[model samples]
Target chain A: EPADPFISLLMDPLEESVGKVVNHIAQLFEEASKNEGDESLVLRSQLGYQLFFLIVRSLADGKREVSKKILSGIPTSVRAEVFPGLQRSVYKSAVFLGNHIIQVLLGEDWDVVGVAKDLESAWKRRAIAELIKKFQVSILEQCFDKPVPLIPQSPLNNDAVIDNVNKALQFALWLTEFYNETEALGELRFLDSTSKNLLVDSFKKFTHVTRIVESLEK
Target chain B: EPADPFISLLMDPLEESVGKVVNHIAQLFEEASKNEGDESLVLRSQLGYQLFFLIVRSLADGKREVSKKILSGIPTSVRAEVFPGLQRSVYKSAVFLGNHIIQVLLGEDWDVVGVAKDLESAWKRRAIAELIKKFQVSILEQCFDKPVPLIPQSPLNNDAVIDNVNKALQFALWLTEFYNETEALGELRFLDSTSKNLLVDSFKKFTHVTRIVESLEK
Candidate 1:
């Protein structure tokens, strides 16, 4: 269900409501664009923030049907303006999202890593990068005071650290792919050389663990 | 330095400023108590919030000298009112403090455990229990889905889990003492039997680790 009245209007998913909300958004965007004042700017920014979270929540929750319908229903001209406003301001919003993503990962539920991947799949590349960048800076630089370990020890005797290193490497692997993507720029600012190399080394040992587990089964 | 102007007045450490701020606080509290409206309540609550953070920060940072001076500088009659405001509202303020304490411990710097001890030393027992209660509920119940382990393994190969279990046990040990203290009532409302037994067992293994370390030196 939509979290608030404004969200309900935009995300109702019914044909009539979708059409009505789309028209409302278009008019609101146009009026805000035409005006020059704090009220206009506030309205415009509020709309963008709402839309950003609507898209992010849908993507995170693995149900994008309503969001997709709303985005497609909007006029292409409006979408052009929408994308720029949302994408550019992601770094600011990402401060909260980054902290949230870490909380989820640190909970030791690795399958939820799909949340990050889904955000990327929806072309929320900037959001994904900012999220990962903030996570790297906070957990790696601030907390651990170093990059990912080459051979992150996962002793069977202690499951807690194994869970931590597992999630860290999981993100590291995703970051490696993020940098290697064709359309995406490889920005060292996001993932520095020390981090990249260590992540790569950790990835090698991670795969080795899988092989070791298979051998034990044999 | 004081975090802000109000804190500076009360926590300045100099005698004259302390006297002035104590008078200011006394009159403000009196006016707030005399009036019956939103403005008064807001100012009163704001004052309490500021004072709460000042004390918590000083205690958490291991520099309670200022907080001690401020508390003592206040009139004994005012101090009586002051304790009620701070102690009763700790559960609310503890939400933030609990999150903070977890962040510090999760960083693997266990020596900082002294921060918790210092807070308790200054008769912040209520704050300490609320902090531990929240931590237990969050880490054990929400995140790990169980109480701490009886024999929390600390393999030599992995340092991460060692740090995690160490901090968990450290808090668990403190929690055990909190229940045993005379002036501090051992209320199971804050900690259940299952949790208490698990914490005690973990404390046993924790002490075992110290013994092992000592034997290694020999």
Candidate 2:
């Protein structure tokens, strides 16, 4: 009996298709990298982390509509399907990992103050503060719009969806504001490379664990 | 002439009232200690943390009623009096602190995970769970009871109070059943000294900052 569908389905997707996958992924990373320089560090991440808050906040306020918005461009129903396949432990790990690491990226805690203060987000303090002010206004403005129209059969109606979106959205918001207010080197600045290197070291540990999770699926 | 009554009042009152304040605080801490040493650490701390939550959650909910409820039997309108006088920064810190630390303590993410998988909570996991179940039952049963009687000068008649109470009350409910089916650890157990010490270290640092705010009088 065959074990996994994803591996199997992709197995026969044809050699050219595999080539396309690799090429596209490379192109995807490179496309953004060109704008970000050889380092390609912060730009997409900056836009990424901020917009994450917006989408989640939108989902928090109005799910079905935001859920629709979340699902809009995806090739598959990640909203519909990929999540349910995950194990409870994996799921919990995903959440707690998001929770703790975000703290490191934007250290406001009594415990991790020196360690964080400026990683990716902590240094970009002013830009983030202004961005946050802008996004919060958007969220407030959206409140006046019509609510997310509920789909009769969709899981979007579940409380869990709201909780998930709200939690992630909140985490994103917390990281920005916490680091935004924090100080380093006598002034408000986002990550100095000194901050980036510290985060990069931790990021290595994280990638190691992620590798294990990838292997665990085997 | 003085900048404000509180600044002037506390400055003078403190010289004479230092004796009264120490006496009262000593007496207050003493009263709890007496009953607590019997069960000691867990008893007072358990009650204190949960009640602190109840007060905050309530204030966060219906501030006026909960304020009165908070100050009831303690003294005057400490609830109404204490909150509005505080800075928005304090309120922000209060909220962000609650949001972040509680996640660490509870460790329930994505709905809930069984009694928090590990860390300090896993140590007291059983007690928290029971506390949650008991609290949930109380909240659910309260839906049937007459709502908190409307108050003098309460703007509570509008939808926000209902929304607010509904929000906090709903949060407590969501937390329990979500992972309450979660059974990782076996029986009830309290925190060991190690957990207390670890938490105390952070508490010291927290209160250290708090003292500055306390002294930033007028």
Candidate 3:
């Protein structure tokens, strides 16, 4: 059960790229934090444009390595900024990817049977994830719609951004459907077949946004 | 009505002290990260001693200001290492304090109107505070006890350190019980004479630790 060679190959270079992207993000945050009033808004606009272009370049490269790295880093790195702007589709796709990566890294196996036992145990004991999920969704939907101002000079207009946002929303809606369908199908019991297939499908659906990012990249 | 004069007086200075404590805890984590083997163990033990002394001093000085400050800062500062050994107690107390503070801040005038709205919304949303209560308990008992390493020094030998930890734990456990009992009574329909008494009793019982903290200042 060696890891897929392609995954490993993608991971190394992606890691290096992530390091660079992280530094750039830190600089952006530092600069953003220092500005006041009108200057703050201008800094935010510039940062948004920079991030939009970076995401586009990463997606257009079409290297699974680069794409996966960027996908994984978004939620972890600029969650406050990036997460709010994301459409439902993007959120659902990202959640699926994030959960899958976590499962792959920490799921039970012969070598690490207790890897995620603590988290699983806590989840079961609480039985509140469902409740939490509902609260999280409502709160995000209510308070999380602040859009990063689109660059007027850029080719991607407000219509394009809105379109991408809607696409993300549709994906998020689809994600819930997929999650429920998979749960009903008992994918947890047959991890390799149902769960793995679900992840693969979600990944494909998630990458559909590549077209939006690619347009921006050009 | 205004906040109690004694409690309000200690708020700012205690906030500063809590911030300092959090910083020291972060430093301990950094030290542990840099060292390995026996060096790491030694640093951990040293950190534990320092933390114990700080807690003892803080408790002994228990001006209402100190307790109020710690209570205010607990949510963010709980994740730090100064109270690594008391993580469970700290978190549980935090949740209890958070709920209590929300109640106090919201006020009795809003009770009837708020309760009706809350109940209606809770039913619509299937909001169950019971699940949160259970989570608070399980998290306290399981995660906190397992990962945190306690100094082997007996409280009998070190009264002040032991007293602080015990007081914190006692306060947290009592709060949990009070919350559980209130929910179990199923008295949400109307705050009658008996119900009002029970609620007041619970509040007084829960805040008893604050009294201990106050006594320490004298």
Best by TM-score: 3
Candidate 1 Cα misplacement greater than 4 A, ranges? A1-218, B1-19, B37-39, B60-62, B75-81, B85-127, B130-218
Model 2 DockQ vs. reference: 0.01
Candidate 2, clashing residue pairs?
A: A123-A189, A123-A190, A123-A191, A124-A190, B36-B40
TM-score of every prediction relative to native: 0.24, 0.20, 0.29
What TM-score is obtained for chain B in each of the predicted models? 0.35, 0.25, 0.30
Report the C-alpha lDDT of model 2 over B95-192, residue by residue, as the tens digit. 33233333323221311322223112211222232233222222222221233221223445624433333333333323322221112111111222
Off by over 4 Å in 2: A1-161, A173-218, B1-218
lDDT measured at residue A89 in model 2 versus the true structure, 0 to 100: 12
Candidate 3 lDDT tens digits, B1-218: 22754223322334564556645554654656466644554344334333333332343334323433443443333233223212322333333343443233223222332422432332211222322332233223322222221222232543433333443433333333332232223312222124234344545554334533333233
Question: Which pairs in model 3 have colliding backbones?
Answer: A88-A168, A88-A169, A88-A172, A89-A168, A89-A169, A89-A171, A89-A172, B10-B65
Q: What clash count goes with each model? A: 0, 5, 8
Q: Model 3 lDDT vs. the true structure?
A: 0.34
List the global CA lDDT of all models.
Answer: 0.39, 0.31, 0.34
Pairs of residues clashing in candidate 1: none
